[PDB]
């Protein structure tokens, strides 16, 4: 019986998974009983693995055997499957399983039950699993494709989680609401919210990644290209290494666009990467066209790969591109010259007249993308007299930032040092 042997091995793995769930529940109970209003993060670190390894028979047997404390809410799980914290964690697992099964109707009903239960039970150590539940509520309503009541619900939950001085829930709710705004392109709303809200300075590195990505997107569409570029570079540095391929691809795409807008040329290592070559190929063509400075190749690339540009969302950025494409030309010219004349700039950029070249370069000076001077008495753009930048306060300022950062890290480490008895 090959099928019976496979089922036997699967059920052995199932018993192992039940043992893992038992260990996680024990960790939760240690968290609630003992001090250190923590260790739920340990319980939840393996949450992706548990969700991946969950099975219909496993969850059915689990719902039959567990929830023995009290209450008959097991009837909200058993028909769909054929304590303070344990119910929340097990129910989070169950709703994740309904997600994996794609049964969004019961998924959303049970999720609303989760939200009513969390509102009823105002607990702090529970608030972490509450934040994960909020994340999965946003995910289920996204799959349902409503994301309308999501705004108000997560927004009130954010109000609760900021009135209670939380960090994890604050970050999660803020990220979810920013994504809700972006989904419908409510960029003004998201900008106002970000301006008037303070992202918790101690939140999960992944929440930092998401928040930095969204803030960079807001800034890019708001025409703060340097701010968006630095923010998304920080986001990319924060994002995980051997995972989150989709998040990395999105960040790379929009950061490539934003850097081209700044007038720079993205690194070729991006496009060469094994995980990003196929996805970024349209942007590789775009970068090639802009660097070559040819409007014809730029336009043909745009026409060929408009579809992916709808899917990602860059068109406003991809025309601000053309703008910063002529800007890229002038920036390269100013990067490899010191006293070039206006006629020479015009000829090199294929502009129409030295008058037009003069306008372009003067505006580039204004925007500070070449950071030079100009002189139309003799019709030549002078560059700033480069100064020996070590007998000045820039090294002091850089070393001051780095010294303060190192001092802060040492203080954080020596504070986090704990002695458990």
């Amino acid at each position: 019986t090959a099928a019976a042997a496979a089922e036997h091995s699967q059920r052995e793995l199932d018993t192992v998974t039940l043992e893992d769930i038992k260990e996680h529940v024990k960790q939760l109970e240690k968290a609630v009983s003992g001090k250190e209003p923590r260790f739920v993060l340990r319980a939840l670190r393996m949450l992706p693995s548990t969700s991946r390894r969950l099975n219909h028979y496993v969850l059915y047997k689990a719902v039959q055997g567990f929830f023995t404390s009290n209450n008959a809410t097991r009837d909200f799980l058993l028909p769909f499957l054929e304590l303070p914290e344990v119910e929340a964690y097990l129910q989070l697992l169950v709703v994740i399983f309904m997600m994996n099964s794609k049964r969004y109707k019961e998924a959303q009903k049970i999720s609303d039950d989760l939200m009513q239960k969390i509102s009823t039970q105002n607990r702090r150590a529970l608030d972490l699993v509450a934040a994960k539940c909020y994340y999965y509520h946003a995910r289920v309503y996204e799959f349902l494709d409503k994301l309308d009541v999501v705004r108000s619900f997560l927004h009130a939950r954010l109000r609760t989680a900021t009135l209670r001085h939380d960090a994890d829930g604050q970050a999660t709710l803020l990220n979810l609401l920013l994504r809700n705004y972006l989904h419908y392109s409510l960029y003004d709303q998201a900008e106002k919210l970000v301006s008037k809200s303070v992202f918790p300075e101690q939140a999960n590195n992944n929440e930092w990644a998401r928040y930095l990505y969204y803030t960079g997107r807001i800034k890019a569409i708001q025409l703060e290209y340097s701010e968006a570029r630095r923010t998304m570079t920080n986001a990319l540095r924060k994002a995980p290494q051997h995972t989150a391929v989709g998040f990395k691809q999105t960040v790379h795409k929009l950061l490539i666009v934003v850097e081209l807008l700044l007038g720079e040329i993205p690194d070729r290592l991006q496009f060469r990467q094994p995980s990003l070559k196929r996805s970024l190929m349209p942007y590789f063509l775009l970068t090639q066209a802009v660097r070559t400075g040819n409007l014809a190749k730029f336009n043909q690339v745009l026409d060929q790969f408009g579809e992916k540009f709808q899917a990602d969302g860059t068109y406003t950025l991809i025309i601000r591109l053309r703008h910063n494409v002529i800007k890229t030309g002038v920036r390269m010219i100013s990067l490899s010259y010191s006293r070039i004349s206006l006629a020479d700039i015009a000829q090199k950029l294929q502009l129409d007249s030295p008058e037009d070249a003069e306008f372009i370069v003067a505006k580039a000076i204004r925007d500070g993308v070449i950071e030079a001077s100009i002189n139309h008495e003799k019709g030549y753009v002078q560059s700033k007299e480069m100064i020996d930048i070590y007998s000045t306060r820039e090294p002091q300022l850089a070393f001051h930032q780095r010294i303060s950062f190192c001092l802060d890290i040492h203080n954080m480490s020596v504070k986090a040092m704990r002695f458990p008895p």
Binding site: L335, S336, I340, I409
Partner: protein, 379 residues
């Protein structure tokens, strides 16, 4: 070691698979002569498929029959060895069979036979010989995966016990692969370490090896190391006496004769486009050597006029201006042009300024790592 396959075969095939050189008929005569001599019916079929050639059935049938008879008799001898002789001769039978498969051009069959022979054999020297045959097949067919796997296998065997001769042959193979994959620094190291004791005549004659060493050394070595190990190299000068153009190239660079240097670099570009191992490196190599020449000229100047640069390099002023602008924009030269009054200022960074910038870069990297670790652990 034996020529199996003669990499000259791959050289001819690649050189033939190029525009403006197809059907010169000298390359075709040479390749057909070799193919007929070694009875490469399968490789002939592959070449016909690749280049869309008029297949000569009359001679193709003869080659097929010769190869089939050879294979059958080798297999019969192998079976006889199994039935009567012991492992010591069964190994030789399999080994000869695999050699013949390589000679004809049966790639996959040859690899399978060599894997079987490697599994059977226990002698360390014969294991090395098998690994070297696999490496030569890998070089011939430019299968980077097989080449690297067998390079690691050879290194592991040498660590598990080897000898100087196989060490040098493996060094030449590693250098050839590095030249193939554009690792000119390691290629220079290996080639210069094995220049005085070149034994691998199956890959290329000593003159070709010395030309490769000169090219790779010029593109990879600084001026002091170049003078110590190439310009003052006994065994390189001895061959450069026979090679008058490679010598002119190398010494035009060394003695700061730049017009002659660009002439020699153009001829090198043509030669090394025609070449099969360097073929996907001629644009990059020419670009890097031009950058090296420009940096070398500007290394002893604080303000060099474009007229003087153009006269020194034997080119126009627009040419030098365009090249300098391109390389400065790419960040490969420490110089800023000034076109209203044509002058090339030299903005090389002071020692302390360079040290400060390096400290900033390395500290930024290390601080990012420290931040990531601290945020991973504090929670």
């Amino acid at each position: 070691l034996p020529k199996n396959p003669d990499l000259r075969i791959a050289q001819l095939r690649f050189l033939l698979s190029l525009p403006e050189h197809r059907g010169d008929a000298a390359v075709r005569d040479e390749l057909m002569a070799a193919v007929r001599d070694n009875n490469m019916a399968p490789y002939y079929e592959a070449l016909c498929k690749s280049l869309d050639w008029q297949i000569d059935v009359d001679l193709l049938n003869k080659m097929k029959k010769a190869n089939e008879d050879e294979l059958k008799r080798l297999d019969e001898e192998l079976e006889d060895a199994e039935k009567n002789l012991g492992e010591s001769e069964i190994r030789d039978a399999m080994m000869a069979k695999a050699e013949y498969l390589c000679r004809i051009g049966d790639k996959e069959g040859a690899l399978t036979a060599f894997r079987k022979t490697y599994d059977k054999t226990v002698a360390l020297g014969h294991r090395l010989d098998i690994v070297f045959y696999l490496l030569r097949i890998g070089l011939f067919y430019m299968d980077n995966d097989l080449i690297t796997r067998n390079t690691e296998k050879a290194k592991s065997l040498i660590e598990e016990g080897g000898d100087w001769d196989r060490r040098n042959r493996l060094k030449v193979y590693q250098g050839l692969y590095c030249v193939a994959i554009r690792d000119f620094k390691q290629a220079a190291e290996l080639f210069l370490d094995t220049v005085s004791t070149f034994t691998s005549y199956e890959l290329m004659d000593y003159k070709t090896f010395v030309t490769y060493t000169v090219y790779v050394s010029m593109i990879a070595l600084e001026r002091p190391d170049l003078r110590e190990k190439v310009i003052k190299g006994a065994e390189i000068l001895e061959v450069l006496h026979s090679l008058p153009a490679v010598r002119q190239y190398l010494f035009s660079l060394y003695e700061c004769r730049y017009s002659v240097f660009f002439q020699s670099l153009a001829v090198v570009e043509q030669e090394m486009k025609k070449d099969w191992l360097f073929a996907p490196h001629y644009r990059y190599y020419v670009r890097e050597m031009r950058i090296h020449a420009y940096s070398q000229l500007l290394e002893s100047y604080r303000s060099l006029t474009l007229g003087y640069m153009a006269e020194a390099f034997g080119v126009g002023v627009e040419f030098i201006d365009q090249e300098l602008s391109r390389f400065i924009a790419a960040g490969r030269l420490h110089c800023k042009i000034d076109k209203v009054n044509e002058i090339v200022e030299t903005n090389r960074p002071d020692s302390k300024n360079w040290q400060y910038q390096e400290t900033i870069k390395k500290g930024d990297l290390l601080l990012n790592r420290v931040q990531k670790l601290s945020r991973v652990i504090n929670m």
